[PDB]
Amino acid sequence: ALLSFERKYRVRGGTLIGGDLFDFWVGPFYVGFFGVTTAISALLGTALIFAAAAQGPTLNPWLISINPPSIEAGLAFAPLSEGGYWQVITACAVVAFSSWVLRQAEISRKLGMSYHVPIAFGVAVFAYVTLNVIRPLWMGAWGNGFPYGIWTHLDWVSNVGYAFGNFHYNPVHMLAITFFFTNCLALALHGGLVLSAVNPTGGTDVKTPEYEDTYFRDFIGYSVGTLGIHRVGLFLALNAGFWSAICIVISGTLYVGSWIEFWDFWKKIPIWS
């Protein structure tokens, strides 16, 4: 009951698992059963990250890298110093993200809201699971996963991308990039329009939604509306995440080779060649 209106909303119920067992708050944070699971998994994952780092060549936070086992090890559980730490941290991260989704669902139920936020975050959880669980399983080795390091997973991204020639020629990658760019443009437009509506110039009063409609019809000839903009932004962000997961999952499992050669299909269409 910190916020001036918070107290009346802090009621029992809305939990999926646990009921009244963990139905309480700790400061601003609601816990629930999935909050307990999130706390355990996330704290264990962080502690194991730092335990594996202490066994590594450096404690520099830039250069800390918890690496997966070698490809020759296949899909077996490796020794902790030889990639097992990475596997345990991956399991902890999966559990933590799933528990975060379920805690968001419980909090949505407590406030009389639908499950839009848990589903939206579950899209990103699916992207991560595709990156570090599904793709290594399909490829046959845990060594295909990206390392747990701030700058070494960028090295993983670079090397995996260049293993296919130029990763820019992946068409699902093109679609995901288009969704990302359109999302950022849409977010700029939506934030700017709302702020300009509530922060007028020239000493005028706060505007109505008719003013936003008029502004975007004078600008580009069309206005999507107040509900439509949030629908479109959610669609764009979720599509960006989902198509990122799809684009990475098919490279190395379904498509092997240079993505540049794929576009030789276009030149062979009998309509123009």
Partner 1 sequence: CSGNTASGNIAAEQAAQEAA
Partner 2 sequence: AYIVGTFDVAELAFLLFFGFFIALVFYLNRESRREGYPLEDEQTGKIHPGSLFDGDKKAFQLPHGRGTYVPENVARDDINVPGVRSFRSAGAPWVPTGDPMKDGMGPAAWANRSKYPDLTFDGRPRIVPIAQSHELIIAPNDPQLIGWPVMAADKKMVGKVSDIWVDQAEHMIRYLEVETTTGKKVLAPMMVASVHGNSLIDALLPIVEDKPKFVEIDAITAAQFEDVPALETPGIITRYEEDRVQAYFGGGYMYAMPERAEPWL
Partner 3 sequence: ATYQNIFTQVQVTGPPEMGVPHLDGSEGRVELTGHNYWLGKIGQAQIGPIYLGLLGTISLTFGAAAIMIIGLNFWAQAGWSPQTFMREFFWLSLDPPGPEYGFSPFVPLNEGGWFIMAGAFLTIAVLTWWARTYTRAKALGMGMHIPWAFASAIWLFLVLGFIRPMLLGDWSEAVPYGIFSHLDWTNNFSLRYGNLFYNPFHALSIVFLYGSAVLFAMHGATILALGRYGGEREIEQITDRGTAAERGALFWRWVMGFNATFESIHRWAWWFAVLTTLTGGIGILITGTVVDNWYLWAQEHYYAPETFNYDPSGAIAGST
Ligand X SMILES: CCCCCCCCCCCCCCCCCC
Ligand Y SMILES: CCCCCC/C=C\CCCCCCCCCC(=O)O[C@H](COC(=O)CCCCCCCCCCCCCCC)COP(=O)(O)OC[C@@H](O)CO
Ligand Z SMILES: COC1=C(OC)C(=O)C(C/C=C(\C)CC/C=C(\C)CC/C=C(/C)CC/C=C(/C)CC/C=C(/C)CC/C=C(\C)CC/C=C(\C)CCC=C(C)C)=C(C)C1=O
- Is 172 an interacting residue with respect to ligand BPH (CB under 6 A)? no
> What is the separation of C-alpha 161 from the centre of its chain, rounded to a whole number of angstroms?
19
Binding residue for ligand Y, selected from 15, 30, 31, 37, defined by CB under 6 A: 37
What value, to the nearest 5°, has the Cα angle with vertex 74 and ends 97 and 136? 35
- Is 122 an interacting residue with respect to ligand X (CB under 6 A)? yes
Stretch that binds ligand BPH, among 145-153, 160-168, 208-216, 246-254 (CB under 6 A): 145-153
What value, to the nearest 5°, has the Cα angle with vertex 147 and ends 141 and 152? 135
Distances (CA, A) of 186 to 102, 149, 180: 29, 32, 10
218-224, long-range: CB < 8 A, 24+ apart? none
Return the structure tokens found at 232: 């479109």
Cα–Cα distance for residue pair 224/153, rounded to 1 Å: 39
Cα–Cα distance for residue pair 59/52, rounded to 1 Å: 10
- Is 237 an interacting residue with respect to ligand BPH (CB under 6 A)? yes
Site string for partner 3, 217-256 (x = CB under 8 A): xxx-xxxxxxxxxxxxxxxxxx-xx---------xx---x
CB 133 to partner 1: min, Å: 11
Cα–Cα distance for residue pair 228/226, rounded to 1 Å: 6
- Is 208 an interacting residue with respect to partner 2 (CB under 8 A)? yes
Q: Which residue is nearest to ligand Z (CB)?
A: 35
Q: Which residue is nearest to ligand X (CB)?
A: 122
Binding residue for partner 2, selected from 54, 57, 72, 198, defined by CB under 8 A: 198
Q: Which residues of 72-106 are buried (b: 16+ CB within 10 A; e: fewer)?
A: ebeeeebeeeebbbbbbbbebbbbbbbbbbbbbbb
Q: Residues 63 to 102: which contact ligand BPH by CB under 6 A? A: 89, 92-93, 96-97, 100
CB 235 to partner 2: min, Å: 16
Closer CB to partner 2, residue 151 or residue 263? 151
- Selection from partner 3, partner 2, ligand BPH, none that 11 binds (CB < 5 to 8 A by kind) is partner 2
Phi-psi region of 156 (alpha: psi -120 to 50; beta: other; left: phi over 0): alpha
Cα–Cα distance for residue pair 27/113, rounded to 1 Å: 22
Binding residue for partner 2, selected from 36, 98, 109, 187, defined by CB under 8 A: 109
Stretch that binds partner 1, among 3-11, 33-41, 76-84, 109-117 (CB under 8 A): 76-84
Residue identified by tokens 């490279």 is: 251
Terminal alpha carbon distance of the chain: 70
- Contact set with ligand X (CB under 6 A): 101, 105, 115, 118-119, 122-123, 126
- Contact set with ligand BPH (CB under 6 A): 38, 41-42, 45-46, 89, 92-93, 96-97, 100, 104, 117, 120-121, 123-124, 148, 150, 153, 237-238, 240-241
- Contact set with partner 2 (CB under 8 A): 1-20, 23-26, 109-112, 198, 200, 203-211, 225-227
